[PDB]
Design a protein around this nucleic acid. Structure first.
Lengths: 105, 116
DNA sequence: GGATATTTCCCGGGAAATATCC
DNA sequence: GGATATTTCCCGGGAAATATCC
């Protein structure tokens, strides 16, 4: 078993080296393209977030919930709150939508 | 002492809920420890262990379905409320036939307790 | 049009909360 | 009173549904 970030870093290589479609890799791995794509999106998140995934301090779906907050600053601010308050994914997703509303004011 | 490390590895590696339960039982006979202390040693809760040990009381037909990976733990656990083995095995085959999930298996259970 | 990115939410493990037993 | 049995439901993986891209 490995970190979502490290699993993503792996998939990336395999898709470069074996000239596969995400679908064909997922079929080869026993997953869905959905799963693979979503994990590859994590490689675009801030390094501080990525390090928290590797250190097993946040979950995949925790980090994935931050992406909607397109600004790295807002992602890392919440990251530390999720750690501090020990927030779940459900209330992390809730927190996100409230910040996007505050931003649109 | 040696058999301990074996099961710890058979536990660390993936196994059937029935076989995980059969394992726990032995470990509690071998070190004579409390469910709490084993769970703490394994990194689980006593809750989890106790619930898995309850599966060893379910009908053999149900237990075989767990090992053969035809039903889930929570599928078999949902049958226990139906205290009669006959009613548990009747639903077992329906869950297989209709390919029912746990949510609608739990629902089915309550309806049979109302009927009986 | 196929591949890929994104949104939504179904699903059951498994543990917290609880009741019961010894 | 502690251990153990039982009930309840929290939790996030991960894939279906969907939108978007090339």
């Amino acid at each position: 078993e490995l970190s979502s970030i490290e699993e993503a870093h792996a998939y990336a290589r395999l898709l470069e080296l074996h000239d596969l479609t995400q679908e064909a890799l997922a079929q080869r791995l026993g997953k869905g393209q959905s799963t693979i794509a979503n994990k590859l999106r994590l490689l675009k998140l801030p390094q501080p977030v990525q390090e928290a995934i590797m250190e097993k301090k946040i979950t995949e779906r925790h980090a994935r919930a931050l992406i909607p907050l397109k600004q790295p600053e807002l992602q890392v601010t919440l990251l530390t709150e999720i750690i501090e308050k020990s927030l779940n994914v459900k209330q992390t997703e809730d927190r996100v939508v409230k910040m996007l509303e505050q931003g649109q004011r």
